Amino acid sequence: QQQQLPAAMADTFLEHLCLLDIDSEPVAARSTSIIATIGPASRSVERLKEMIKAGMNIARLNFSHGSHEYHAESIANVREAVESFAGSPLSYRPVAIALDTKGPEIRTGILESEVELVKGSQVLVTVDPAFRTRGNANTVWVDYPNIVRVVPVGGRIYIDDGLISLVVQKIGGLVTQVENGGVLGSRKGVNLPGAQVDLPGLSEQDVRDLRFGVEHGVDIVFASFVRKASDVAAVRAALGPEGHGIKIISKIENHEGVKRFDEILEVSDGIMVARGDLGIEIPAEKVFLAQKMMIGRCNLAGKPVVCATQMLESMITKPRPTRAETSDVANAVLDGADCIMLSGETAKGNFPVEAVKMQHAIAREAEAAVYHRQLFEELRRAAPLSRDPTEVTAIGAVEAAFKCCAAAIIVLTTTGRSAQLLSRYRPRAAVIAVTRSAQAARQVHLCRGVFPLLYREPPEAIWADDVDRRVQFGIESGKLRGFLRVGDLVIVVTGWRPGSGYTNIMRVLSI
Amino acid sequence: QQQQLPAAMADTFLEHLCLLDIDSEPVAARSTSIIATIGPASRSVERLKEMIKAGMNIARLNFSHGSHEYHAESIANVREAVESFAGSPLSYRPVAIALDTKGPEIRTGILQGGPESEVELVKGSQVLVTVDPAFRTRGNANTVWVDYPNIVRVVPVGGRIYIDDGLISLVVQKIGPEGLVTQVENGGVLGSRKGVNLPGAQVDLPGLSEQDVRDLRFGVEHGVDIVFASFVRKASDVAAVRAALGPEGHGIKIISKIENHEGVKRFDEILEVSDGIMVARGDLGIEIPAEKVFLAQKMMIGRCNLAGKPVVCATQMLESMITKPRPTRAETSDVANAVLDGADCIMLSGETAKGNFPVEAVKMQHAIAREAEAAVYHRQLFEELRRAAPLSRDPTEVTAIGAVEAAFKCCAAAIIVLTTTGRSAQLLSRYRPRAAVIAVTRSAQAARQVHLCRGVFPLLYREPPEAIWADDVDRRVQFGIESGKLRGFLRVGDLVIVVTGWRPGSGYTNIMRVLSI
Amino acid sequence: QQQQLPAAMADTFLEHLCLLDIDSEPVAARSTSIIATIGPASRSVERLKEMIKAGMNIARLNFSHGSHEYHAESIANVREAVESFAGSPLSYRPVAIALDTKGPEIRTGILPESEVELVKGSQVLVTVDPAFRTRGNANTVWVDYPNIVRVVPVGGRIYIDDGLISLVVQKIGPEGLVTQVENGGVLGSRKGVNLPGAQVDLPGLSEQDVRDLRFGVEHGVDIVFASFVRKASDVAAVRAALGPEGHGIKIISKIENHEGVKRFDEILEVSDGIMVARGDLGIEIPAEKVFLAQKMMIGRCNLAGKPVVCATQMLESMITKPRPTRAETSDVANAVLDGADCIMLSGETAKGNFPVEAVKMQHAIAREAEAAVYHRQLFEELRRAAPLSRDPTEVTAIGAVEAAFKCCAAAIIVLTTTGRSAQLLSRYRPRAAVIAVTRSAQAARQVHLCRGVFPLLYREPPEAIWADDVDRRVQFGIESGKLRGFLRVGDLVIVVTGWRPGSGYTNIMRVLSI
Ligand SMILES: O=C(c1ccc(NS(=O)(=O)c2cccc3cccnc23)cc1)N1CCN(CC2CC2)CC1
Ligand SMILES: O=P(O)(O)OC[C@H]1O[C@](O)(COP(=O)(O)O)[C@@H](O)[C@@H]1O
Ligand SMILES: O=P(O)(O)OC[C@H]1O[C@](O)(COP(=O)(O)O)[C@@H](O)[C@@H]1O
Ligand SMILES: O=P(O)(O)OC[C@H]1O[C@](O)(COP(=O)(O)O)[C@@H](O)[C@@H]1O
Ligand SMILES: [Mg+2]
Ligand SMILES: [Mg+2]
Ligand SMILES: [Mg+2]
C-alpha cells in the first residue's frame, strides 16, 4: 500500500513511526506550498516558467533591497511567466505574489572601510545626529534615538547579523563593553535581544512600498518585525481601503513577538516564523521551540503559518542538500507548516529550480507520513463548537473523505474561506478549490492542501448548471493533472445560494 | 447546562463520571426503544393506547404460550390502538410487532399421578433420567423422563441438569443403559411437562421446531415486522428460520436470541447472518452461571455495537414492578446500565404481559433511558466506533459518518434522513449521534422496523409524490421538521443535518446539508 | 486465558468489552468488600461463622431500631464467630463492625401493632395539629414535623414507610394538607416520611444519635455509617460526639438526599468515605436519577482515594428467593465496575431467608466483575488525576502498582500500622491483591473499606532485630497467601516496606519470586 497507509491505521504515534516505509510511495498531490524568493537567479521569464513547473506557488519580493522599478519588473516577469500557461485552463496553476516589507530597522552609521571592535574594550553607542558619519572603533552611531531608552544596563546590542555583541555597562549615550568582537563596516543591522523596540509598526519606506504593492495588485504582505497587534493594525491601515483584500502574514522575528504571539495571530491572517532574525535575537538552540510553538498555535487557529529561512541553505552552491536540510524541510511539514520557503536558494543561488524540486519532493514524502489519526483527533478536540454551516460542512466533508479514502474534496469558493475551513482540519485528500476570483486562487496557496483552479467561463443562465459546470471543471482538471481517476470517490462541497458565506452542502460522488 | 453536556465535554472517562449531574435535565427525545410483551395485563385496545402514549415502541408476542387465534386478536388490538392515532400524521407513532418463537425445548414427562399431580424430588436422593418411552407417563420421585433421547450423550459425569426454570438441579452420578443416575443438588416440587436445561452441553435440537415453522408462517401471514428466534445456537438455526419465513417473509428482520453457552461461544457466526441480537438473560442465567450473565451481555452488546446491528437487553429489568408500583434500585440501575452498555432496545416481559403496573413499567423504562442516554460519554464512544469501523466506499455510510461528525460539531438537534428500507437511518444510528435521527419514510413496515436502531424516530409520510421529485424530497424534509417541532424536539433557531440522495429508489443516499430551523 | 487477561490488553474500551469471556475464570481473590446487615436472620454465632466463611468483611448494625442490649448481643456474637478462627493465624479473617446511626427522621403518629389501610384514590388528611397526634386512621395522618404543611405544595409528593405509600397534595388549608393516595398500602405506627424536593431543616445529630455513638465508642466499633449527612457540619458533629477516645473510628458519610448530593465535595473533604445510600436517595430524588448520583459519587471517591460504599436492594429478591434476578446480578457487577470499594446487603442478610446465599452470590459476582475491570484506561486516568507527591509512601505505592502491572504480580505485600500504605496502593486499583500485614487489630479490620486490601493480623512478638521482624512479617504474608490460595510457587510479588519503625516511613519496593 502507498501513501504510508500501513502506518496510517496505527494505534500509537510510536507504532506509526515504526511503520513508516521508504517503499510506500506518495500518491496524493503535494500540499505544502513553496514560497520562492525572487532575485538575479530567478528573474528571467524562462527561468520563472521553469520554477512554476517545478512547483513554485508563491513568488516573494524582498523589499529589503531593490528599487520600486526593480520590483515592478520582477512582478511583470512573474506575471508573464504565469500567464504563459493561461492558454490551457485545465492545467493553469495560479501563482501568488507576496511583498516582504523592509520593516523597521536599526542601522549603524557610515564610518568599503571597516574598523575592528576588540573584545574587552569600551564602545559607546550614540544617537547624536552629529555622529551620522563619524564611526570609530569605540563609537557606533545608530539611527534609533530611543535606543538609549529601551536597552537597560546589562542589556545587549547585536550588530552585523549577530556577529558583534555589546553589553551595556553604563547608561545615559549607552556605554558598552565588547562581549563578541569583530570587523564592522558601514550601515549594518542592529538587533536588541529581549528589548521592547519602540519603532512604529511600519517605517516610511514601508508605507511607500505598501502603496506600491497595492498599486501593483500584490496578493500577500509578509509584514516584518511584528511585535504586537498594533503593528498589524498599522500595516492594515497603511494598506488602506484599497488593499483590504490582501492577506497579512505577520513575521515574528524577535523575543517580544514570540511572547505576544497570541495577540498578533488574533489580528493577522497568518504567521511567518522568520528563523534568521529570530536566531539573532534569541539563542539559536531555542529557535525550534519557537517554531513548533507557533506552528502548533497556528494549526489550532486554522490560520496559515510559514516556516522560512535557510531550509536548503547549502544548495546556494551545491546541487544537492545536506541531510540536515532534508530533515528540516520534512520536519517543518510534520510540525504542521502550511508553506515552506526558499530565500537565497532561489534569489541568488546556482540551483534555484533544483532547490524548488527538492522542497517539492521532501514535502510530498512528509505529508504522506503525517499521523492523521491523532492529528485529526486533536484538531477536533481543540477547535471550538460552531454553528456556522461552512465549518460544520467542512468537518463533515473531511470526516467523509477519511472514511472513504477519497481522492479529493472539490469545493466551490468565492473568497477561499470554504477551502481554508476544509484545510484547517488537515485532510489527507486534496482540497480542489474552483473559483472565479483570480486573487483568491492565488491567496489560497497559503493554506495546506488547497489546490486552486481558476474558472473563466461566463456564468450560465441557470445557477445550478453553473455550479455543476464548475464541479466538472474540478473533476477534469484533476483528471488531466493525474490526481483524479475514473472510479475514484470525491467529496464535493457547495452552497444553497449564490454569494460567499453560504456553503452548507456535502456530496459523495464517483468519477 | 442540560443534557449532561458538562460531563459530555470531559477529557477522561473518570472525569465524565465525576461531572454527571442529577439536576441536568435531558432534552433529547428518548432514543432506546422499549419492547413490551403482550398479555392479559396489556391486551385491550385502551390499555394498548396507554402503553403507546407511555412510550412502547415494539409489541412482543410470546409464542411460548397462546393459540394462533389468541395472537391474531392480540395483533388486531395492537393495530387498532396504533391506527387510532393516524388522524394526526405529524404525531403518529409507528409500533412494530415482533414474534418471539417458542423454540426447541426439552420437557419432562407427565407424572404417574396424572396431569394435575405433583411429586417431590428430595435433595440428596437418587433420580434416574431416562429416555425409554415406557416411562413417558411413569413419572415419580426417583425417575424423570424427557422427550430428548440424546440427553444420554451430552451430559457426562459431573454435569448438571436443570428442571422447571432452574428450580431443580441434578449432578450426573453415573451413565448407563437405563439412563443417567443422578443425585439431586437442588430439590423441589415437580409437575408435569416441565422445561429442561443442560448447562454447557452441545444440544442437537434442530434449531427450529415444527410448531415454530408453523408459527413463523402465521407471522408472515399476519405481516409481523420482526422475529425473535429462540434458542439460536447456530448460523444454521437462523438459516432455517430464514428459510421457513420463505420468499414472502424476506423483509422480516431476524433477531437471534442467545440463551446458552453455545450461542455465546458461537456469537460471531450467529451475528454474521442475523439482523440483530437479543441477550435473553432469563434462560441464559439458567444455562450459564448467573454471576457471569453480565459478562455475556456486555460482550454481545459490544460486538453488536461494533457491527452496526441492533441488540436487545431482555428479562427481569423491572421485575419487582409486576406487583409493585415502583422498582428496586437494582432494577433502575439495570435499565440505565443496559442503555450505557450500548443496547438499542430494552424489554419488559411479565412487567407488561401479566403484571399489575404495565403502563408504569413502560413509563419508568422511558424515564430511566432518557437520563442514561444523556449520560453517554459520546467523545470516547464516537472515537472508538470510528476507529473500529472499517473503511467504506458505500456513499450511504460515508454520508452517515460525515453527518454524525457535523451533528457533533454544531450540537444539531436532529439528523433528518429520508429512507425507504431504513438502511440510511441505521447507518446513522451505528455511529451513536447525540442528535435524534428523524427518519421520514413512505414504508409503513420500515417505519415499524427502524425502532430496532437506537436514536431513530420514524415518521410515516402519507401524501402521494409531488409532480417534481425534488419538490417531494423538500416536502418530506419539511414534514420531518414540522413533526419534530410539534413533538417538542425541534425549535426555531436549531440546526439540523439533512441526509438525502441524488435519485429516487433505495441505495443512493449521498447528500448531507446543514440547515437552521 | 483467565482473569479476563485477553480483554486486559485491549486498545479501546469497546474492544475490551468485546473481548470479555465467560470461560475466562477469575483467579484472584475477591477484592470488593462485602457489608452484611445484622438482624434476626444473621445474629447466631453459627450463622455468623457461615457468613464469615461466605465472604462477609464488615458487620453493619442498623441503629434505626433495636435497644442497646440487642446490638451489644449482636457485637458479642459477631466477635465470638470471628475469634473462633483465631486458632489458625495464617487463615484468620479480620471482620470490621460498623455502627449505622438512626439519623434525623420525620415519622407519622401512633395509631401496638395496630394497622390501617390507605386505599389508592382516596382522600387522606395530613395534619400537624397536636390534638390529632394519636388519631391516625385511613383518612388522617399526623406527622411530628410541623413545617410539613408549609413545604409541600399542591402537586408535591409525600412518601410514607420507606416509600411504600405515596400521597399527592390536592388542597392546602388551615386543617392541613388534603392529599390523594397515589400509591396505597398498609400503614403501621410511627413510620418514616420523606419529602422529595422540600427544604427540610432538621438537627444534624439527634440525642439518640449521641447516645448511640457513645455506645459505639464504648464497644470499640471500627466504622460509623453516618446517616443523612448533608453538609460538613454534620460530620463534624459526628466526630465530636465520638469524642477524643473515638478519634480512630472511621466516618463514612451516607448521602441520602438532594442536599447531600449537591454538597458532596465539602462532605467528602471531611469524611473518611461515602455510602451511596440508594434506599432513601431514590425516594428523595427521582428514581431514574439515582444511577447518575451513584456513578458521580463513586467516581469522585475514586478520584479522592477514599472508600465508597454502594448500598441497598442490590440482591433484594433474595429476601425470599434462593436466586436473584438478572437485574440484581447486573447491579452488583456494575457497582463493582463503577468503582465501589464495598457492596452491601440489608434485608438480604438482616431478615431474609437466604443470608449466607446472598453473601455467596455477591462474592461470586464481585470476583467476576473485578476480573473484567479495564485496568489500562483506569490506571492511566487515576495516574493523570492523582496529584504529584513528595510523600515517599505515595511515590512507592504508585511505583509498586506499576511494577505489579508490568509482571502480572500475584500480590503486593505491604506492612502497615494504620492501613495508610495499603490504602495508597488501593487508590491506584491494581489487578494484584494488596496483602497488608499489620499488628493493629483495629487497622486490620478498618482496611476492609479499601478495595483489594486483604488484611492479615500478625500476632507474634517482635524479633530482637527489627529487620528480622520485617522479614518475618513479609514471610507471614507470603505463607498466608499460599495457604489461602492467593500465591503459588513461581509467582512474583511486590513487597513494600519502610526504612525505620513507626507509621509514615514506607519507602521501599522489592521484587520477589515465590
Ligand atoms: O460507567 C460505566 C459506563 C458504561 C457504559 C457506558 N457507555 S458509553 O456509551 O458512554 C461508551 C463510552 C465509551 C466506550 C463505549 C464502548 C461501548 C459502549 N459504550 C461505550 C459509559 C460508562 N462503566 C463501564 C465499566 N467501567 C469499569 C472499568 C474501568 C474500570 C466503568 C463503569
Ligand atoms: O468559501 P466562500 O467564499 O464562502 O464561497 C462559498 C460560496 O460558493 C458557492 O458555492 C458558489 O457561489 P457563486 O455562485 O457566487 O460562486 C456559494 O453557494 C457559497 O456560498
Ligand atoms: O435508506 P434507503 O432505503 O437506502 O433510502 C434512501 C433513499 O431515499 C431517498 O432519499 C428518497 O428516495 P424516494 O424518493 O425513492 O423515496 C433516495 O434519494 C435515497 O436513495
Ligand atoms: O501504612 P503505615 O501506617 O504508614 O505503616 C507503614 C509502616 O510499617 C512498617 O513497614 C513497619 O513498621 P513497624 O515495625 O513499626 O510495624 C514501617 O517501616 C512503615 O513506616
Ligand atoms: Mg528582520
Ligand atoms: Mg427460552
Ligand atoms: Mg436511610
Report the alpha-carbon distance of residue C199 to residue C258 in Å, rounded: 9
Q: What sign for the dihedral angle of Cα A58, A62, A63, A68?
A: negative
Q: Which three cell numbers stand for residue A309?
A: 529561512
Q: Which three cell numbers stand for residue C352?
A: 431474609
Q: Which three cell numbers stand for residue A407?
A: 481522492
Residue owning grid cell 514601508: A206
| H-helix or E-strand spanning residue A255 | helix A255-259
A237 HSE (CA, 13 A, CB side): 10
- CB-nearest to B514 from A393, A405, A508 is A393
Active-site annotation holds for C312? yes
* CB of B383 shorter than 6 A to ligand 1: no
Q: Map residue A218 onto helix, strand or coil.
A: coil
On whether the CB atoms of residues B343 and C200 are closer than 8 A, the answer is no
Q: Map residue C290 onto helix, strand or coil.
A: helix
On whether the CB atoms of residues B252 and B239 are closer than 8 A, the answer is no
Report the alpha-carbon distance of residue A82 to residue A305 in Å, rounded: 24
On whether the CB atoms of residues A247 and A236 are closer than 8 A, the answer is no
Report the alpha-carbon distance of residue B155 to residue B172 in Å, rounded: 7
Candidates A86, A140, A147, A154; CA nearest to A109 is A140
* Size (chain A), residues: 511
User: How many H helices and E strands in chain A?
Assistant: 19, 22
Q: How far is CA A22 from CA A1, A6, A322, A356, A372, in A?
A: 12, 12, 19, 22, 18
Residue owning grid cell 429512507: B419
B196 HSE (CA, 13 A, CB side): 24
Candidates A105, A92, A104, A95; CA nearest to A74 is A95
CA of B18 relative to ligand 1 center, distance in Å: 13
**Which residues are within 8 A (CB) of A215 and not within 5 positions of it... i.e. 6 or more apart?**
none
User: How many H helices and E strands in chain B?
Assistant: 19, 21
**Long-range CB contacts (< 8 A, 24+ apart) of A261-266?**
A261/A293, A261/A294, A261/A297, A262/A297, A263/A228, A263/A229, A264/A226, A264/A227, A264/A228, A264/A229, A264/A231, A264/A232, A265/A297, A265/A298, A265/A301, A265/A303, A266/A229
Helix C232-242 crosses helix C207-218 at what angle (to 10 degrees)? 50
Virtual torsion, Cα A191, A196, A200, A204, nearest 10 deg = -10
CA angle A428, A52, A489 (to 5 degrees): 30
Q: Map residue B456 onto helix, strand or coil.
A: strand
Residue owning grid cell 473485578: C370
Q: How far is CA A401 from CA A7, A485, A491, in A?
A: 18, 16, 6
Residue owning grid cell 486554522: A302
CB atoms within 10 A of CB B425: 28
CB atoms within 10 A of CB B76: 12
Best A403, A424, A510 residue to mutate vs chain B (most B CBs within 10 Å): A403
On whether the CB atoms of residues A333 and A297 are closer than 8 A, the answer is no
**Ranges assigned E (strand) in A5-153:** 33-37, 58-62, 96-100, 106-107, 115-117, 122-126, 139-141
Q: Which residues of A touch B497 (CB under 8 A)?
A: 392, 396
Give the resolution in Å.
Answer: 2.1
Residue C65 identity (one-letter amino acid): H
Method used to obtain the model: X-ray
**Ranges assigned E (strand) in B20-167:** 33-37, 58-62, 96-100, 119-121, 126-130, 143-145, 160-163
The DSSP secondary-structure symbol of B511 reads E
- Closest-CA residue of C relative to B12 is C381
**Which residues are within 8 A (CB) of B319 and not within 5 positions of it... i.e. 6 or more apart?**
B331, B350, B351, C317, C325, C327
On whether the CB atoms of residues C249 and C223 are closer than 8 A, the answer is yes
Q: Point out which residues pair with C251 in neighbouring strands.
A: C224
On whether the CB atoms of residues A469 and A412 are closer than 8 A, the answer is no
CA angle B133, B138, B143 (to 5 degrees): 95
- Touching A: which chains, 3+ CB pairs < 8 A? B
Q: How far is CA B403 from CA A397, B418, B433, B511, in A?
A: 9, 13, 9, 9
Sheet holding A430-435, edge to edge: A450-454, A430-435, A408-412, A489-495, A503-510, B509-516, B495-501, B414-418, B436-441, B456-460
CB atoms within 10 A of CB B445: 18
Helix runs in C287-373, H state only? 290-304, 326-338, 347-350, 355-371
| DSSP-assigned letters across all residues of C229-286 | --SHHHHHHHHHHH-GGGTTSEEEEEE-SHHHHHTHHHHHHHSSEEEEEHHHHHHHS-
**Cβ neighbourhood burial of C201 (10 Å; 0-12, 13-18, 19+):** exposed
| A408-412 and A489-495 strand pairing | parallel
Report the alpha-carbon distance of residue A55 to residue A35 in Å, rounded: 9
The DSSP secondary-structure symbol of C61 reads E
Report the alpha-carbon distance of residue A168 to residue A423 in Å, rounded: 48
Report the alpha-carbon distance of residue A485 to residue A510 in Å, rounded: 10
- Closest-CA residue of A relative to B402 is A396
On whether the CB atoms of residues C434 and C426 are closer than 8 A, the answer is yes
On whether the CB atoms of residues B340 and B376 are closer than 8 A, the answer is yes
Q: Map residue A342 onto helix, strand or coil.
A: strand
The DSSP secondary-structure symbol of B25 reads -
- How many contacts (CB atoms, under 8 Å) link B and C? 201
CB atoms within 10 A of CB B340: 19
Candidates C93, C77, C41; CA nearest to C447 is C93
Residue owning grid cell 440487642: C70
The DSSP secondary-structure symbol of C300 reads H
On whether the CB atoms of residues A409 and B403 are closer than 8 A, the answer is no
Q: Point out which residues pair with B511 in neighbouring strands.
A: A507, B500
- Asked if B54 is an interface residue toward chain C (Cβ–Cβ < 8 A), one would say no
**Cβ neighbourhood burial of A5 (10 Å; 0-12, 13-18, 19+):** middle
Report the alpha-carbon distance of residue C480 to residue C462 in Å, rounded: 18
On whether the CB atoms of residues C41 and C349 are closer than 8 A, the answer is yes
Both ends of chain B: CA-CA distance in Å? 21
Report the alpha-carbon distance of residue B510 to residue B396 in Å, rounded: 6
Candidates B382, B402, B384, B383; CA nearest to B392 is B402
Report the alpha-carbon distance of residue A312 to residue A345 in Å, rounded: 7
* CB of C20 shorter than 6 A to ligand 1: no
Candidates B193, B197, B185; CA nearest to B121 is B185
**Which residues are within 8 A (CB) of B117 and not within 5 positions of it... i.e. 6 or more apart?**
B111, B191, B192
On whether the CB atoms of residues C24 and C371 are closer than 8 A, the answer is yes
Q: Which three cell numbers stand for residue B356?
A: 399489575
Please indicate whether, in this complex, the C-beta atoms of B14 and C299 are within 8 angstroms of each other: yes
Both ends of chain C: CA-CA distance in Å? 21
Active-site annotation holds for C107? yes
| B33-37 and B345-348 strand pairing | parallel
Q: Go through A418-427 and write b for each residue having 16 or more CB atoms within 10 A of its CB, e for each that does not.
A: bbbbbbbbbb
Q: What residues does ligand 3 touch, defined as CB less than 6 Å away?
A: B 396, 418-421, 423-424, 500-501, 503-509
- Asked if B3 is an interface residue toward chain A (Cβ–Cβ < 8 A), one would say no
Residue A37 identity (one-letter amino acid): T
Distance from CA of C441 to the nearest CA of B (A): 33
- Asked if B415 is an interface residue toward chain A (Cβ–Cβ < 8 A), one would say no
* CB of C18 shorter than 6 A to ligand 1: no
Q: Which residues surround ligand 6, an ion (CB under 5 A)?
A: B 283
Best B4, B12, B15, B17 residue to mutate vs chain C (most C CBs within 10 Å): B17
Distance from CA of B294 to the nearest CA of C (A): 6
Q: How far is CA C221 from CA A137, B64, C57, in A?
A: 90, 54, 14
CB atoms within 10 A of CB C131: 8
Report the alpha-carbon distance of residue A95 to residue A59 in Å, rounded: 7
Candidates C125, C108, C137, C215; CA nearest to C179 is C125
Q: Which three cell numbers stand for residue B160?
A: 448438571
Q: Map residue B309 onto helix, strand or coil.
A: coil
Active-site annotation holds for B93? no
The DSSP secondary-structure symbol of A384 reads P
Query: In this structure, what are the phi and psi dihedrals at residue A326, rounded to the nearest 5 degrees?
Result: -60, -45
| A450-454 and B33-37 strand pairing | unpaired
Q: Which residues of C touch B376 (CB under 8 A)?
A: none
The DSSP secondary-structure symbol of B278 reads E
Report the alpha-carbon distance of residue A269 to residue A338 in Å, rounded: 13
Q: Map residue B23 onto helix, strand or coil.
A: coil
Active-site annotation holds for C459? no
Query: In this structure, what are the phi and psi dihedrals at residue A249, rounded to the nearest 5 degrees?
Result: -105, 115
